[PDB]
Amino acid sequence: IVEGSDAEIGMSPWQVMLFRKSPQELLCGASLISDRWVLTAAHCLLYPPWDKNFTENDLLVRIGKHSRTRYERNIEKISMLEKIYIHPRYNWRENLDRDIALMKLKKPVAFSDYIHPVCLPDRETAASLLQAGYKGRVTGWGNLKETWTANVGKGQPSVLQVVNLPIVERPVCKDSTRIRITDNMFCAGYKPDEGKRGDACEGDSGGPFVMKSPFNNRWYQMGIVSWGEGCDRDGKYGFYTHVFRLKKWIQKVIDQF
């Protein structure tokens, strides 16, 4: 996260860290949507152009964390994956359309002050809140800057970061990039002349873009950090997977009933 701030303890209890077993490294962010399901971006698991193709045995899910590097004994919880599901129409070949994936945990996680699921939007909540100008919130342990000299510090935060950003009008999103945009994505961030700034960055991928409903005071995950050109560059915006538009697929693989 660039131009963000330290998160408060328990401010984002649905935040999940996708961690590679070996070499031990942070891969992406993710979100907890129930006791046995985690939501993330498909590009975190599968991206052929760079020979990235992870299986359930390759990673661990870390829930309830605040610190990025420490093993928060007695607080964070670790889970193994039973199975991964990538959207069958995930378009890694051209524009990352349908950049979404579900991960089933081997055993249900127990909730606590620091671990709690986020809600998925219903048709009307999405309708009321997904409007240009409305702000959402993005969190992650990703890089603090697009680039920074090596050995001279670390562009990595020691604690979860947070930043609030406004949803941007579709024509402005489209006119900011050469990539072909679809209805399954929306973009967010400040415009060059709005003064304030901020963006997600490398390492933040797969994390949640959430909004608080003023109708029922609940937090809803409206997007997933998908892609962006550089980090926090003027004239550029971060793009997110439109969760509500892919909800039927989500509900389908869950068959919770």
Partner: peptide
């Protein structure tokens, strides 16, 4: 069911440092 209500915030009727910034933008 109990989704989106944080144990340390909504559940206790406490607000985090910047959530008001979101609500003030909803209109």
């Amino acid at each position: 069911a109990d989704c989106g209500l944080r144990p340390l915030f909504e559940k206790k009727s406490l607000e985090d440092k910047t959530e008001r910034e979101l609500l003030e933008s909803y209109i």
